[PDB]
């Protein structure tokens, strides 16, 4: 599923991401835009052989099991394919654990390089939220 901007904002708000650990909703929509272009089916391989999955590009090195990342962890206790679903529940619940791990949203390289320090509230402008 490719989400609309306000559609994703509304679903993220309903799942409790607005101001989660102090990050306003615009931060999460900005992160999703530059991580996956709002596409739940996005995948990208990393140099170490791990793979990033879903709308927030969650990494199999630490967070999910894809059966092809030996020696890795599965801290969200999910198969990585669950992160590709049109239902974003698993992605959001895993993201909540990531952002709580001490580095905040700096865990997402696209957020640090393209969202941090910008007017992130622009990403929810116009939405009925």
Residues forming contacts to Na ion in the complex (CB under 5 A) are 60, 65, 69, 72, 74
Strands 58-59 and 51-53: antiparallel
Closest approach of Na ion to the CB of residue 44, in Å: 15
- For residue 116, give Cα distances in angstroms to 18, 75, 77, 106: 16, 26, 29, 9
Closer to Na ion by Cβ: residue 24 or 43: 43
For the question of residue 35 being annotated catalytic, the response is: yes
What is the C-alpha separation between 32 and 56, in angstroms, rounded?
5
* HEC letters along 68-97: CCCCCCCCCCCEHHHHHCCCCHHHHHHHHH
Out of 7, 18, 48, 52, the active site residue is 52
Closer to Na ion by Cβ: residue 15 or 61: 61
Closest approach of Na ion to the CB of residue 3, in Å: 25
Closest approach of Na ion to the CB of residue 48, in Å: 12
For the question of residue 7 being annotated catalytic, the response is: no
The residue whose Cβ lies closest to Na ion is 72
Catalytically annotated residues = 35, 52
- Which residues participate in the annotated binding site for substrate? 101
């Amino acid at each position: 599923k490719v989400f609309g901007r306000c559609e994703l904002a509304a679903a993220m708000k309903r799942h409790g991401l607005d101001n989660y650990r102090g990050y306003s909703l615009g931060n999460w929509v900005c992160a999703a835009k530059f991580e996956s272009n709002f596409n739940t089916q996005a995948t990208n391989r990393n140099t170490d052989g791990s793979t990033d999955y879903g709308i927030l590009q969650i990494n199999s090195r630490w967070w999910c099991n894809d059966g092809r990342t030996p020696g890795s962890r599965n801290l969200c206790n999910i198969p990585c394919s669950a992160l590709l679903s049109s239902d974003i529940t698993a992605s959001v619940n895993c993201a909540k654990k990531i952002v709580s791990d001490g580095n905040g949203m700096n865990a997402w390289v696209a957020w640090r390089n393209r969202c941090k320090g910008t007017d992130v509230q622009a990403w929810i402008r116009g939405c009925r939220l």
